[PDB]
Design an enzyme around this catalytic site. Structure first.
Site, PDB file in Angstrom:
ATOM      1  N   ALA A  57       0.841  -1.203   0.000  1.00 48.68           N
ATOM      2  CA  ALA A  57       0.000   0.000   0.000  1.00 48.68           C
ATOM      3  C   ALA A  57       0.867   1.241   0.000  1.00 48.68           C
ATOM      4  O   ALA A  57       1.916   1.269   0.615  1.00 48.68           O
ATOM      5  CB  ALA A  57      -0.900  -0.002   1.236  1.00 48.68           C
ATOM      6  N   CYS A  58       0.419   2.287  -0.660  1.00 47.95           N
ATOM      7  CA  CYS A  58       1.105   3.568  -0.506  1.00 47.95           C
ATOM      8  C   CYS A  58       0.097   4.714  -0.599  1.00 47.95           C
ATOM      9  O   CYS A  58      -1.019   4.483  -1.079  1.00 47.95           O
ATOM     10  CB  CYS A  58       2.244   3.698  -1.525  1.00 47.95           C
TER      11      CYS A  58
END
Length: 102
Positions: free
Chosen positions: A8-9
């Site tokens: 995730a970012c």
């Protein structure tokens, strides 16, 4: 059993980390399923059964991930950049269960 990952970012890195993990897993002859949490949403969401069966889960994330589904599981929590820079280390730690119980 197979090891699992979530990447995730903030801007939704997410996909580069998934790629690096998948390519390295194939090199190492091990299976992996990678859930991504990007800008378009969640792809390849981990199932409850997959989580139950996993030796550990790699969470390579630079934004918040839903974590309560992992209670009681070994979770290797690292920055998303670790998925890109050191996928072998993460995979081999997950396989060895070298990760704390969440």
């Amino acid at each position: 059993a197979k090891i699992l990952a979530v990447t995730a970012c903030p801007t939704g890195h997410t996909f580069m980390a998934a790629d690096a993990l998948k390519e390295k897993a194939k090199e190492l002859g091990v299976e992996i399923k990678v859930e991504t949490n990007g800008s378009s949403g969640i792809k390849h969401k981990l199932t409850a059964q997959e989580i139950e069966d996993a030796p550990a889960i790699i969470v390579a994330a630079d934004k918040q991930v839903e974590m309560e589904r992992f209670k009681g599981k070994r979770v290797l929590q690292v920055p998303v950049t670790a998925g890109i820079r050191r996928p072998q280390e993460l995979i081999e730690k997950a396989m060895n269960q070298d990760a704390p119980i969440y």
